[PDB]
Ligand binder design. Structure first.
Ligand code: ZN
Length: 313
């Protein structure tokens, strides 16, 4: 496990940098520093009220453990990861592959977890999405119904905090007028402004209106190696899904040298739709509402020794 210290501006500073960027991409933008809303309420319904306190990102494993051929031995425990990143009782959000070792099929994982500590009873509020073997569509389930553990597999991009109320950056962006998705626009704005001083960010956003391109991985792994993005995209199942969607992004402006996934966003909803976010497909009507914080630290766990740049969209 490697630790890296991010650059951490004010709140006020980031807000102003992100607004100017987003204004180039979207017609109606507002970014401001606000009190975090109570995230135990709808539409989030997290096990904790906020995303503040001891913020950090964990990048665990990677796409090179999935592709070209899968190493199914690469299994992880998110409760244990919390201790590894020096925050027992961390509240964890983000995106990863689901635990096939408990579920019995592949899936997209939406970790939403109050991990265990001496003062915090654990709650696994995670969701998982997998390809319906009936009609090829999306089946979204709450992990705790099917399994009672903290497992995931292969790769995870996570934003961890103490889950406390406090100040966060609120982003309102409506009507896309440029080619970037919501997350890419933010990440690329931060990199353009800050350069050599890396910034990491996470939290949650709602797609309130519009549709998106997403994907879900098939229930079983390929026998043959998936050696290119074209081959990977043929194996993956793609969808158009509709608002409202609750999204969990993790993004980093510049990789200081840890073989990072720079952008990764998974989502769930109350209407049976979830998976891996690509972009919105209705730019004139799309509405995003986000709550974000910068990360103080990056932790790199089980970085692949053998790597490549395939399959990172
Ligand atoms: Zn994904």
């Amino acid at each position: 496990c490697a630790e890296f210290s991010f650059h951490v501006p004010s709140l006020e500073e980031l807000a102003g940098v992100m607004q100017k960027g987003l204004k180039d991409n979207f017609a109606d933008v507002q970014v401001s520093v606000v009190d975090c809303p109570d995230l135990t309420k709808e539409p989030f319904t997290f096990p904790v009220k906020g995303i503040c306190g001891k913020t950090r990102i964990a990048e665990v494993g990677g796409v090179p453990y999935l592709l070209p051929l899968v190493n199914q031995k690469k299994v992880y425990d998110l409760n244990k990861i919390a201790k590894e990143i020096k925050l027992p009782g961390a509240f964890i959000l983000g995106a990863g592959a689901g635990p096939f070792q408990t579920l019995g099929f592949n899936s997209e994982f939406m970790p939403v977890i109050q991990t265990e500590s001496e003062h915090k009873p654990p709650v696994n509020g995670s969701y998982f999405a997998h390809v319906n073997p009936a009609d090829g569509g999306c089946l979204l389930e709450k992990y705790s119904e099917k399994c009672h553990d903290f497992q995931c597999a292969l790769l995870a991009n996570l934003f961890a905090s103490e889950g406390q109320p406090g100040k966060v950056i609120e982003v309102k962006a409506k009507r896309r007028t440029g080619p970037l998705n919501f997350v890419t626009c933010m990440r690329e704005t931060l990199e353009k402004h800050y350069g050599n001083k890396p910034i990491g960010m996470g939290g949650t956003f709602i797609i309130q209106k519009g549709k998106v391109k997403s994907h879900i991985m098939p229930a079983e792994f390929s026998s043959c190696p998936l050696n290119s993005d074209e081959e990977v995209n043929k194996w993956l199942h793609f969808y158009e899904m509709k608002a409202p969607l609750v999204c969990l992004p993790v993004f980093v402006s510049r990789d200081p040298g840890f073989d990072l996934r720079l952008e990764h966003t998974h989502f769930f909803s109350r209407h049976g739709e979830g998976g891996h976010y690509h972009y919105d497909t209705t730019p004139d009507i799309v509405e995003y509402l986000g709550y974000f914080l910068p990360a103080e630290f990056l932790y790199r766990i089980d970085q692949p020794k053998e790597t490549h740049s395939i399959g990172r969209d």
